[PDB]
Amino acid sequence: SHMQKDFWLSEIGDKNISLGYYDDNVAIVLTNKTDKILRVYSYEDGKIRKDFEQKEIITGLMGDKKIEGDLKTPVGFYELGRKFNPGDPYYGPFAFATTYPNLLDKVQGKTGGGIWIHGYPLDGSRLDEFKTRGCIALFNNNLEKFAQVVQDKKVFVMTEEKEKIRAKKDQIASLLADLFTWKLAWTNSDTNTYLSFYDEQEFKRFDKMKFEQFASMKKSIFSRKEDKKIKFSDINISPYPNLENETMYRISFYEDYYTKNYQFRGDKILYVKIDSKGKMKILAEQ
């Protein structure tokens, strides 16, 4: 059933999956770089609630971030770390670090870091789009409320450039069916089906291997024809804003496997697009 889109459509039902479909409760920090609005939404079993909002925020520069020093705020889907104290009053009372660069950023060769949500200089110095070095600044008098809303939660960061990016039920359902079809192909050492879920042109890796060599490597590995038992859990699927006019999603999950002497849980992440035929194509894989 898990390989059928309509099974997932039934599971999703009337849930609000516009900011993603999550196995458990999460918060989503949604920033739009054109609107200069940051909102925090809680997701509870498909019910969305707006818990925080500030308008007239300061972000970094427009455009897709590429390198250390370009001053741009990254567009995409990230995670937020716990409140911390920079120890420099320039950042306001405290800060929260986003995970820029993520795996997709890295395999695309992007550089930089230090993309945080923080406040304003305690001495009153003004901020502008050039001074945050890509960080997102909220007024200090709103940061206590922001901190309370994100405290002790699993918190994601969704940053749009201009267009409003929302997940669609049909896309989440089709991707979940593709995910479990890809899982079955790996389980059965079915090289051809497995490889059909990778973008022959755009899939990128740390080791810079091209698709032809990746295909032959996987066929070699799969030739062991090992009997495998694998379970996915804690699946989170999220829409992925981008400036390439692609329908992209992030899929994260735990990979579980029992061994006669150990049960292993490992974190998996796929960054994917939906191709013109409606099929998942993996662009980066942990």
Residue numbers in the entry: 40 to 325
Please, what does the article write about this entry?
The helical morphology of Campylobacter jejuni, a bacterium involved in host gut colonization and pathogenesis in humans, is determined by the structure of the peptidoglycan (PG) layer.
A recombinant Pgp2 construct (Pgp243-325) containing residues 43–325 of the native sequence (cjj81176_0915) is enzymatically active and was suitable for structural characterization. The NTF2 domain contains three helices (α6–α8) wrapped around a curved antiparallel β-sheet (β8–β11), which together forms a cone shape domain with a broad pocket. Regions of high sequence conservation are observed on one side of the molecule, focused in two clusters. The first cluster is in proximity to the catalytic triad in the LD-CPase domain. The second cluster is formed by 17 primarily aromatic (41%) and charged (30%) residues that are clustered in the pocket of the NTF2 domain. The conserved CPase active site and NTF2 domain pocket are ∼40 Å apart along the same side of the protein surface.
